[PDB]
Design a protein around this nucleic acid. Sequence first.
DNA 1: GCGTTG
DNA 2: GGAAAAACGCCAGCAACGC
RNA 3: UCGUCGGUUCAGCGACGAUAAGCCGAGAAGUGCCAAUAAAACGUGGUUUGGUAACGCUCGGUAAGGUAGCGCUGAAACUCCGUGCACAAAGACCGCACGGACGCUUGAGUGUGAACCUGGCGUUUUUCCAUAG
Lengths: 407, 200
Amino acid sequence: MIKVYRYEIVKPLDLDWKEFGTILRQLQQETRFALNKATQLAWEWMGFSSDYKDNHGEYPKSKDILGYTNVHGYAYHTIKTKAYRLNSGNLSQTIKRATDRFKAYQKEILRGDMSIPSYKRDIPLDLIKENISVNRMNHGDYIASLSLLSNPAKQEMNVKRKISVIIIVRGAGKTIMDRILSGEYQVSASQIIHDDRKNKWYLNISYDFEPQTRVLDLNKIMGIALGVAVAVYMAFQHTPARYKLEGGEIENFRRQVESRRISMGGHGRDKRIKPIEQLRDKIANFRDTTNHRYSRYIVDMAIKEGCGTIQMEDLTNIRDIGSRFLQNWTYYDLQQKIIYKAEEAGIKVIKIDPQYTSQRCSECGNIDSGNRIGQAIFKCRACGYEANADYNAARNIAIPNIDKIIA
Amino acid sequence: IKVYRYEIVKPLDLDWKEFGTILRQLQQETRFALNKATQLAWEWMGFSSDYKDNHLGYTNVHGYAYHTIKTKAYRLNSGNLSQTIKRATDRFKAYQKEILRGDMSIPSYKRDIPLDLIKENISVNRMNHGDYIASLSLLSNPAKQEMNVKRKISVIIIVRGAGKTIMDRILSGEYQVSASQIIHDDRKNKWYLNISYDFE
DNA sequence: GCGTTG
DNA sequence: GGAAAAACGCCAGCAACGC
RNA sequence: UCGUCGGUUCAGCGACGAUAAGCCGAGAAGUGCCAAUAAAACGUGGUUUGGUAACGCUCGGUAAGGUAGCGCUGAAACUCCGUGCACAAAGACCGCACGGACGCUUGAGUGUGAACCUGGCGUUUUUCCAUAG
């Protein structure tokens, strides 16, 4: 597996902040140039190869026309003249990302289902894993030394070695960095990113790690239902334990940003929109934090009951997902967090068809549309089953092949 | 100079399977001309590479692209093909500096493409019975001598309520029909007609 | 340790 | 209609050799 | 009430700012506006150049924690005490380690609480206004 942790850059060691910021903005401009020109050169090679097969009879060899096995090798040779300030391994990784995205999606681009990808202004800075080195000092500082410049750029900017910055390593980042420095974790290709709200630069480190091996019974399954009266309900077949998440904080935040959006010149488009994007980024960050909390609770309640399989709904064909509690949520974000945290815990996630799953009684299996009589309570007809509707739904999810059993 | 769309229920002298096949063929040629005009605008503006030039009586990129494209895009009407190639070349010329600077990649065009229609190829008519006929000149002569479509394609358009004020001033003489498009909606499977109109 | 190409 | 925003969706997260 | 700093996100707490849903610059890529000039394509069509500053025109500025003064001493941000190590202005310093005492969570972990897999690209609808039934 591989995860990402960010660290705040305090200051460069031998530079000033003004020179360091100028260098970072210039390398951002060069990264954006390299991405967009590698996309243009890959598109031009696609068109040339189509015209070559039309005029000759076969596809042209890239090694004969361009001089290179890959179009990445030609794009490096072209882009390297105007992107001379980037470190050449970082430039090679950037062009590799651009040409790999164009190569993986070439049939979708030729069919017209996907656009040709354009790249934006505030772009992250790539760093291959040989260009990162972190060291802890005796007085408690952490120095990250980064190869960011080429050999001409180091001479034109009067830099002699790698650029060393001080990073803050606190909290869980202390644990990650201590496992990096002892060899237990392995650094992958990483980023320099920027945060406009706090005006902060970050080293975004991608690390390879081997997760903890547990013993979990694959035959025990936990079912998760997106309730209409509580937010998430979790149930089991082999045990009458039931867990739930209700949104008290969700209901509070949902009208504390609705009571604030009741009231809501001549200097461009970026004014007249600056105070509303604060509220929008606040809402996005709240949803991200809430989905992380919910995902950790759902995977923790499956570690607790020894389950080796998680089953939840499939939301691609519902279209009335606004009738649930959460009500407009980022459900895809929550489910992806469920998936990676369960894969890290050792649990299989199986999405199932939510065919009816709320009219079926979960004790015998009779499906009647008049079963739920007020959106919180559940009454059966064939066995007189008395239950909560979300718990009955979550217990119907936890059956191993319930989507074939219903239909 | 504003737009109003009008949903098409049916063609008069055709069924919804012949007319749909004709529109999908026209969409394929429209997308071909849009992509090829972007390639030829890339070649015309310099911009290319060494490996292509190491391998003309035209004033502008529009004429060179038109005379190159019109052989393979022969099923489209000639004014409609000219209006399509103008859209692609003007999109390339409005974005040429960012394409050169590397602030943008190549302009691209989607599969469910609109079909262009110059104002010489759009007609509307009310009768005494109450329906609304839109007459559309969509094919060329080598296409009309092969699909055996005899006249302009006449379809019935839903003109209700808000657009009914818009259409009548078209038939009065007060509004002038500008260049329009035939568009498609995939989720509804619904063909619309984006009539553009003028007022001064 | 950067640079170039598979 | 216009002009944007946001939910949904997918995948990566280089390697080997030469100066 | 909204915001700034206290490692990241959400909340709290401490200290601050606020007419900040404010105030001001420069510039000219675009939508207008004003001048001329008018190609490709089939009379229709709308071309090319310059100016102008109205613009959800373009690029930016503008408030917000605290810190010891004679080459040594060591002050100051989210519990206290001790011993070390490091530090004279700071977008950059207010930290780190070990030992203990007090708590907290479930003998360990912990020190305000919970959490901490991101980045890039694409798609398609939904908002929000304007508009008319």
